[PDB]
Amino acid sequence: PVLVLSQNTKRESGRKVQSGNINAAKTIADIIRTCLGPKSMMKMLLDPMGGIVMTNDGNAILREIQVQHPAAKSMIEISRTQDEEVGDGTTSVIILAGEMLSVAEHFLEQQMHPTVVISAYRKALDDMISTLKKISIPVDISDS
Amino acid sequence: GMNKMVINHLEKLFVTNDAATILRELEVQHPAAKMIVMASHMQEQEVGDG
Amino acid sequence: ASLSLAPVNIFKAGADEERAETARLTSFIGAIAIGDLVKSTLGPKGMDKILLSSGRDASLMVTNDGATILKNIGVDNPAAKVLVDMSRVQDDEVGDGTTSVTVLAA
Amino acid sequence: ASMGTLAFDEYGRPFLIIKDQDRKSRLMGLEALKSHIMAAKAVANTMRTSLGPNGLDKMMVDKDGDVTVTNDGATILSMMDVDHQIAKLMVELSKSQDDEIGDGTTGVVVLAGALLEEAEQLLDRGIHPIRIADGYEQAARVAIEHLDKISDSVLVDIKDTEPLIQTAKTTLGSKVVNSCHRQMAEIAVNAVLTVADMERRDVDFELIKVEGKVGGRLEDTKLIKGVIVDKDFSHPQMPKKVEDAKIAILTCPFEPPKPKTKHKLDVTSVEDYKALQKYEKEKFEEMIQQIKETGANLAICQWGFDDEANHLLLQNNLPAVRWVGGPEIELIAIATGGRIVPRFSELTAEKLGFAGLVQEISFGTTKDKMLVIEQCKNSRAVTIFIRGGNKMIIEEAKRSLHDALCVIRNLIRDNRVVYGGGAAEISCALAVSQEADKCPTLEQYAMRAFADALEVIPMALSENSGMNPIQTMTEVRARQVKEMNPALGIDCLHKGTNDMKQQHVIETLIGKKQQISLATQMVRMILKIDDIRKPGE
Amino acid sequence: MMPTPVILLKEGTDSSQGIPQLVSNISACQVIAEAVRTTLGPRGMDKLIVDGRGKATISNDGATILKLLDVVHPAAKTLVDIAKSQDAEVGDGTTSVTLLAAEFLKQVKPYVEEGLHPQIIIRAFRTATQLAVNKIKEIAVTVKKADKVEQRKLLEKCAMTALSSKLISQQKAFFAKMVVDAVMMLDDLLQLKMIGIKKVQGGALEDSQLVAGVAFKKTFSYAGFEMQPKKYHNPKIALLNVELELKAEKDNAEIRVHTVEDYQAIVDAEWNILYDKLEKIHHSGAKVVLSKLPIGDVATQYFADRDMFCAGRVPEEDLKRTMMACGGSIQTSVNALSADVLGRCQVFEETQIGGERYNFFTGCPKAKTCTFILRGGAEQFMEETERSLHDAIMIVRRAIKNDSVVAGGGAIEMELSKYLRDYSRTIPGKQQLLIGAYAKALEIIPRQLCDNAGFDATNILNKLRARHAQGGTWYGVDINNEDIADNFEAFVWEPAMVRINALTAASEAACLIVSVDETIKNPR
Amino acid sequence: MEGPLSVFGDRSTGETIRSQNVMAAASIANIVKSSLGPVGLDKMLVDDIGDVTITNDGATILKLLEVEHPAAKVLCELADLQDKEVGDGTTSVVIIAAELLKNADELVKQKIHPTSVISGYRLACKEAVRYINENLIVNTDELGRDCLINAAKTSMSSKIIGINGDFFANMVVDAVLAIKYTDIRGQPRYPVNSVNILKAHGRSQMESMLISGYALNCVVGSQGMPKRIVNAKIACLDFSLQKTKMKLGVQVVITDPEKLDQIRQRESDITKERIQKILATGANVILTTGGIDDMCLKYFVEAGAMAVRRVLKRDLKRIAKASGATILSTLANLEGEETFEAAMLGQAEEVVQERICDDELILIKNTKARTSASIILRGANDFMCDEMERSLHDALCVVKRVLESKSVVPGGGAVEAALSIYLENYATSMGSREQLAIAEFARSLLVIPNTLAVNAAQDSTDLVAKLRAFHNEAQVNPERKNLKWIGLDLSNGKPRDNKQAGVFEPTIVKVKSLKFATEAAITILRIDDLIKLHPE
Ligand SMILES: Nc1ncnc2c1ncn2[C@@H]1O[C@H](COP(=O)(O)OP(=O)(O)O)[C@@H](O)[C@H]1O
Ligand SMILES: Nc1ncnc2c1ncn2[C@@H]1O[C@H](COP(=O)(O)OP(=O)(O)O)[C@@H](O)[C@H]1O
Ligand SMILES: Nc1ncnc2c1ncn2[C@@H]1O[C@H](COP(=O)(O)OP(=O)(O)O)[C@@H](O)[C@H]1O
Ligand SMILES: Nc1ncnc2c1ncn2[C@@H]1O[C@H](COP(=O)(O)OP(=O)(O)O)[C@@H](O)[C@H]1O
Ligand SMILES: [Mg+2]
Ligand SMILES: [Mg+2]
Ligand SMILES: [Mg+2]
Ligand SMILES: [Mg+2]
Ligand SMILES: [Mg+2]
């Protein structure tokens, strides 16, 4: 056998990879979609050490579940990032990322280039930041 | 439209861009897709194109 | 070079080709084995052999006849087969001499 | 060797083109040519030791352990369990020589192997294998014309058979039956001349029955001008000898007649039963009475008969043979001059054959009997009865005598004769060398190689005879060129003289031409191959 | 690329899609071409393939080689198919077609990798193919004289060219004369079943021969056949489909008698049935008797006593050829054996041919059939001889039907490459590149000729490209001189339909392979 | 084996092995072709354990891959060498080497001798280098600092810091100018790999920070120590501050119990005295490559100093060079005593422990005696942060090359089109077979703009034809030589003056790419046989 790459090296490419990544992300989102808001319901997770985790926390859930798709891995990692940075919004972030990828799937199917989509996303992010800072209000932290 | 070369379980080769033929020679196993294929084959039977 | 000792073997799996000295060696050894077997039956003071077949019937013969002895043995050497057939043809032509012709050939 | 396809893709996706391509092999180009040449050289060097009077035999063992000792190249290569396809081609080449000629089956193989061995060096020097094949074709044409030029002619008449006997002795010199050299040559010649159509120039070998029986000595082999059958008289009290035998040849079993169509004879009364009984009795009596009234003293049936017929023959003094095979019935008819009769009603005194002696022959302490029919008037059929001390020498005697008969046939077909002992090969090599000298193109090398290959037969004869190959061959070549005498060859038998015309060493011109042509054509077909594909295991 | 609880297709479906799949198809076609490249031209070589049973086939014929290769690639099967189609429609050019198709694919491979639309590529291919075909039809030399000597010269030259690639090239004049006599002695239909090809192991190529008549091997004679004579000097010939032997008068027939007199009558009646058939055959004057059905020993001996010749179980094709040669009809009944239904030849003989016995019917002047008898030192030798002769025969047939000749050695390919380069330099610039690639692809025939011969294809193609642009259209590769030459004067002639169909088939295969954009293998 | 040659292995020979080598090289190049240019896309790589790597760097991809074929390992090592010697072009060099191999094997199939192909490639490489150096370079002096910014933005296009290039290029340029230093021989040196790059998932990319000073991936050793110091006097030590243990060849053997107490206390008082000597000079921040026992950390705590342990040797060397300190492996002078001079101290306008998302690090700000630079990259996860690190390293190397050699060339296939034209015209003069080899070299060079357009999803044929038309007009009409600067605009699918658009690459990138690609093609093309021995 005269191979160029080692056997077990499988290479996927193209719109199959793009749609697969987007589906993995939106699946990670669908996992915890119902754990958002005041009327959420608990989930009982079973650790490999015979333990139990009864929670509503997006990062807790995604940290207790295990995946093999690298897109899902990346989504769990960004949930961890959100939790470590601010300590809240760990499932709002997941849902927003899933929805953004979902809506980008449209333009990707419609021959738009991912770099074009990305430039649009970055413009929109800057303008989101501007709008948030404009609509924000101050706080007197001395008011217990 | 580009042609496809479908090889069925009997190792027979079909080179075509005829949708109903491609569907026939594929082994569609999901039931909803099977239903869409049933619709396509009924269209082929009734009209012959489309 | 040679049919057997060539970079390519020209034969089906299981065949073989003994060349000059190897062939003469196997031939002489087979013939002389047959002859040494069939002698000691030669002459008035010759002694008999027990054939003792190995089939499921396990036939048992006590013979002094060289033709009978050679007919009733499992021979695999071609030269030995030649001598066996020679003794059989002697036994067909005349009824005696089947041990002397074999001993002489050997 | 190398595999069919070794990419699997420039993109990582499966690349499957041929079925079981991973288990399949392939050899391409000059390495393929050299593999072919190596295989052919192996076969040829196996065969070259069985060439000439001092040539030795080979002991072939089949799948079931039966032994065959032989010097016949075609029989050897047929018994040889070869796997290489080029060796299979060489077996086919030898078989073709045997079909067309019946002699030369070892010369063809040796010569083809030599041609390929020389092509090996020519390919090393970089010549195109097709150019080699074309130079070989050119040199082969030159050698064929030189054979036609140096050929001699012999008389194929039935009065003086000494030239034919010399030819047959040359053919049989290399076989185990050279202990009875002249007896075997005489009987091969007399056989073909008795059964040979001189006007048509055809010789039907179905009319020559070559029978062998263990016992006796090789010297006991004789020519029967007639037929021998492996049967005896039907009744044990019949006489064992019949002189001045008028023979009735019949293919009707001496039994009550029987329709071929599905039939049911219905018995419906005691009178019907008695009529049937009397019909059967009278049928038997009528058959025997018809055979007797024909005047015959002997009957020969093809389909056997029953107790009533046997005893009626005995009572009526009609010795009879039964269960004789179709071919032997035909031979008996042809030999005795009789006509084969399908039923007794059609039998007449003119359809009978005549043999001056019909005898039953014993073979010592065996209980087996044979029937000889001979002393016919002008038998156009004949039998060769071979005796010997073992079935191995009997079978070798059979095939050697077949070679001799085929050689006499080739003489009857074309009386032209070249002299052997490698003399013809040396002369053709000289002619090819001269033509290569006169050739200015690149085929000069191929023609010189063809000459050096033609010279392997005298070298092989010398080697098998213990002489020094190069010395002997160069001296006889020098003598041929100096004193123009293409009858100078190898003194294999050490008679002193190198003159094959004086030693009566004789070959057939069509035989030598067929050798050269077949060797050249097969070498061309082998050199034209540059790619082998074979299935795994 | 994500798991689903229920998958759309059956587990194991392998789908290759896109530019990689297309490039891989082109590569597989390149492999298939490589498998036959070295057989092209007078310096071409033979291939030895072996089956699972261990039986080897040795061939120069590209169609044969590709049939024997167990090709399974869906795109590479197309080259095998077009080689089959070429062998069908023409009978020669099978290697050229595959080489041309694969070279078209190789030439367009770069643009395929750079994203050129396959529809554009196939449009360019169709355009260039139509142009080249019309140019062949325009510049093909068709002598409008209908002279018989010139038409035999033409057929002999086309056959010599078609044979100057095989293992019988050293006898191609001989075999070409024989092939030409054969197809010129055939009837209007030029049926291939009307040319017999017997293969008798043993003998030389020059010992092979053509029989202006019919010949077939002796067929299982019974006793008395040697008592029969074996040469007749003006025989009348009875061709029959009749079993002549004692047999059940019918398989569903049952005789019922209740008397021994009736029993004996029935026995004698069977015998009289047979003897009456034989007596009718004997009284028809026929001295030779051939039956598609068995002829028993009784009938054999009857004919031997009447000094007649009989042969049974003769094969149907040999019987039909004997009929077309001698001029009779095959009879299932022997009740009307008139001279109109009997056949006739000037000589009938049974001779020995290399270990076998053969019956020869010679001297038939009204013969619309001939039989080749091929000699050689091996089964595969004779098989490749037969294949070469089949190539030559098909060529001669097509030439007889349309004597419009072009020159070979790559002359026509170089002329068309020049013409297509010229045409491409006059179009916008997208189709320009693709038609120029077509043109460069056409050069694969002289290039491969020089390769197989051992020359510098680069220098020779430079010489040819130069000489074809200076004026001159039949200049191609000269093999024996390692140079170029006017191949129309050197008599390297090729029927125009050969190259027309080669271009058509190669372009169609290329267009198909390039139109395929996805491959879906279902699990077995 | 089956052949007469008894070697215990397989043997490929001739067109078989040549086609195999080309197939391998093409495979490797087709892996990376999709990651070339501003429209290229990134790749995931999974390491059989779930370890994920996002990347656009061709060298990184080919290092992570597990290659089995030697002709493909050659190209992998080629990409590695390009990354070592240049820092950019790691994909283009592989693509060009593979295309040179393809065309050269096509010529060898047409039976041009490989020696002749190799001579032609060597000639074409030399003449392409010369033509670039003579006609296609732009002086960064004539262009100013926006030249550096444009080179950085050009390098960052095709990376995940592309559109943010407007700001990342400013950061990169500021950092390289900060770490600029001149040595003996008065040559300006820009020692990248001295810019520290830290990664910390969290705030957006735009929130990445340029530190005027140095950033240390370390923390204080004790929570009782301060975590901010303003007038930082810095002591860099290459030895450990622990309870002193006698060395291997020294043993304590007591025969008078009254000495044991003093010996045991001395074992700690030695290090105590060393620490007091260090602290007496004013050192309030102490970085150490070794460890610091708790006993010592308590001394630092009581002194109000900031001690840091297990610092890395390279980080310490950089902090020392940047702050003016002297790394001490020992407190030992030329007088056989133990002292610490205030001249061995360094200075910094502040040293603080700053809180990054969920970790903590130390920032040394405004060091004197030299300026230093660190960059804290901030993204959405470790994958993003690692790819940002690799992209930023590429950009830093690019700016370094632009500042060392003051020549740039335009991008977007401008150089490749110009070289294709010039070399297809130049081949006409050199031999007859080397001519074909040089023409094929020229045609091969076009694989870069072809790939750029293919990835941009544009008509590669039309675009490269327009490019070649422009550059031929430039090389045949002396009045339009300004057309040399035309290349691809992959956002619009139209040629464009890339010198005015700001698509610049360091000349060294293209030159070294060409030289290395030619060397790789020559070495692989020289192979006409292969003997693969069966392992033992
Ligand atoms: N009474 C005897 N005295 C001397 N020699 C004898 C006597 N009887 C037999 N022989 C010798 O013994 C041999 C016979 O031995 P036997 O066992 O019959 O051998 P084979 O089977 O070959 O005939 C003969 O050669 C004969 O000369
Ligand atoms: N008595 C002889 N003296 C010299 N040469 C002989 C003699 N008999 C045969 N030869 C040569 O031996 C060669 C080999 O023939 P042989 O091997 O006997 O038959 P085949 O070649 O058919 O097996 C022949 O070419 C012949 O010329
Ligand atoms: N004598 C010759 N000289 C030069 N070229 C020839 C000669 N004979 C045939 N050719 C060329 O060889 C090419 C292929 O020959 P051949 O192998 O017979 O074709 P195929 O294998 O396709 O049937 C033809 O295109 C023809 O032009
Ligand atoms: N803005 C741009 N417009 C056109 N081409 C560009 C631009 N930026 C980079 N390129 C081209 O991209 C090619 C390499 O891109 P990239 O993959 O980022 O570099 P590397 O070769 O180091 O992998 C260069 O040849 C360059 O000409
Ligand atoms: Mg919350
Ligand atoms: Mg439609
Ligand atoms: Mg002989
Ligand atoms: Mg042909
Ligand atoms: Mg880059």
Side-chain angles (χ1 to χ4, degrees), chain D residues 500-514:
Chain D
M500 297 296 122
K501 181 196 181 71
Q502 170 180 164
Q503 302 197 227
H504 293 324
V505 171
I506 289 173
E507 297 186 11
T508 63
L509 172 62
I510 54 181
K512 253 304 168 186
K513 290 206 294 181
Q514 182 70 14

Coordinates of all heavy atoms in Angstrom, one line a residue, chain D residues 500-514:
Chain D
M500 N 28.5 -36.4 -42.6 CA 27.2 -37.0 -42.2 C 26.6 -37.8 -43.4 O 25.9 -38.7 -43.3 CB 26.3 -36.0 -41.7 CG 26.7 -35.3 -40.4 SD 26.8 -36.5 -39.0 CE 28.6 -36.3 -38.6
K501 N 27.0 -37.3 -44.6 CA 26.6 -38.1 -45.8 C 27.2 -39.4 -45.9 O 26.6 -40.4 -46.4 CB 26.9 -37.3 -47.1 CG 26.5 -37.9 -48.4 CD 27.2 -37.3 -49.6 CE 26.8 -37.9 -50.9 NZ 25.4 -37.5 -51.2
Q502 N 28.4 -39.6 -45.3 CA 29.0 -40.9 -45.2 C 28.5 -41.7 -44.0 O 28.4 -42.9 -44.1 CB 30.5 -40.7 -45.1 CG 31.3 -42.0 -44.8 CD 32.8 -41.7 -44.7 OE1 33.6 -42.6 -44.2 NE2 33.3 -40.6 -45.3
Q503 N 28.3 -41.0 -42.9 CA 27.7 -41.7 -41.7 C 26.2 -42.0 -41.9 O 25.6 -42.6 -41.0 CB 27.9 -40.9 -40.5 CG 29.3 -40.6 -40.1 CD 29.5 -40.1 -38.7 OE1 30.2 -39.1 -38.4 NE2 28.9 -40.8 -37.8
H504 N 25.6 -41.6 -43.0 CA 24.2 -41.8 -43.3 C 23.3 -41.2 -42.2 O 22.3 -41.7 -41.8 CB 23.9 -43.3 -43.4 CG 24.5 -44.0 -44.6 ND1 24.6 -43.3 -45.8 CD2 25.0 -45.2 -44.7 CE1 25.1 -44.1 -46.7 NE2 25.4 -45.3 -46.1
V505 N 23.7 -40.0 -41.7 CA 22.9 -39.2 -40.8 C 22.0 -38.3 -41.7 O 22.6 -37.4 -42.4 CB 23.8 -38.4 -39.8 CG1 22.9 -37.4 -39.1 CG2 24.5 -39.4 -38.9
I506 N 20.7 -38.4 -41.6 CA 19.8 -37.9 -42.6 C 18.6 -37.2 -41.9 O 18.0 -37.8 -41.0 CB 19.3 -39.0 -43.6 CG1 20.5 -39.4 -44.5 CG2 18.1 -38.5 -44.4 CD1 20.1 -40.6 -45.3
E507 N 18.3 -36.0 -42.3 CA 17.1 -35.3 -41.9 C 16.2 -34.9 -43.0 O 16.6 -35.1 -44.2 CB 17.5 -34.0 -41.1 CG 18.4 -34.2 -39.9 CD 18.6 -32.9 -39.1 OE1 18.0 -31.9 -39.5 OE2 19.5 -33.0 -38.2
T508 N 15.0 -34.5 -42.7 CA 14.1 -34.1 -43.8 C 14.1 -32.6 -43.9 O 14.2 -31.8 -43.0 CB 12.6 -34.5 -43.4 OG1 12.2 -33.8 -42.2 CG2 12.5 -36.0 -43.2
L509 N 14.1 -32.1 -45.2 CA 14.2 -30.7 -45.5 C 13.0 -30.0 -44.9 O 13.2 -28.9 -44.3 CB 14.3 -30.5 -47.0 CG 14.2 -29.0 -47.4 CD1 15.3 -28.2 -46.8 CD2 14.2 -28.8 -48.9
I510 N 11.8 -30.5 -45.1 CA 10.6 -29.9 -44.5 C 10.8 -29.9 -43.0 O 10.3 -28.9 -42.3 CB 9.3 -30.6 -45.0 CG1 9.4 -32.1 -44.7 CG2 9.1 -30.3 -46.5 CD1 8.1 -32.8 -45.2
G511 N 11.4 -30.9 -42.4 CA 11.6 -30.9 -41.0 C 12.4 -29.8 -40.5 O 12.1 -29.0 -39.6
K512 N 13.6 -29.6 -41.1 CA 14.5 -28.5 -40.7 C 13.9 -27.2 -41.0 O 14.0 -26.2 -40.2 CB 15.8 -28.6 -41.5 CG 17.0 -29.1 -40.6 CD 17.1 -28.2 -39.4 CE 18.0 -28.8 -38.4 NZ 18.1 -28.0 -37.1
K513 N 13.2 -27.0 -42.1 CA 12.6 -25.7 -42.4 C 11.5 -25.4 -41.4 O 11.3 -24.3 -41.0 CB 12.0 -25.8 -43.9 CG 13.1 -25.8 -44.9 CD 12.6 -25.2 -46.2 CE 11.5 -26.0 -46.9 NZ 11.0 -25.5 -48.1
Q514 N 10.7 -26.4 -41.0 CA 9.7 -26.2 -40.0 C 10.3 -25.9 -38.7 O 9.7 -25.0 -38.0 CB 8.8 -27.5 -39.9 CG 7.7 -27.4 -39.0 CD 6.6 -26.5 -39.5 OE1 6.6 -26.1 -40.7 NE2 5.7 -26.1 -38.6

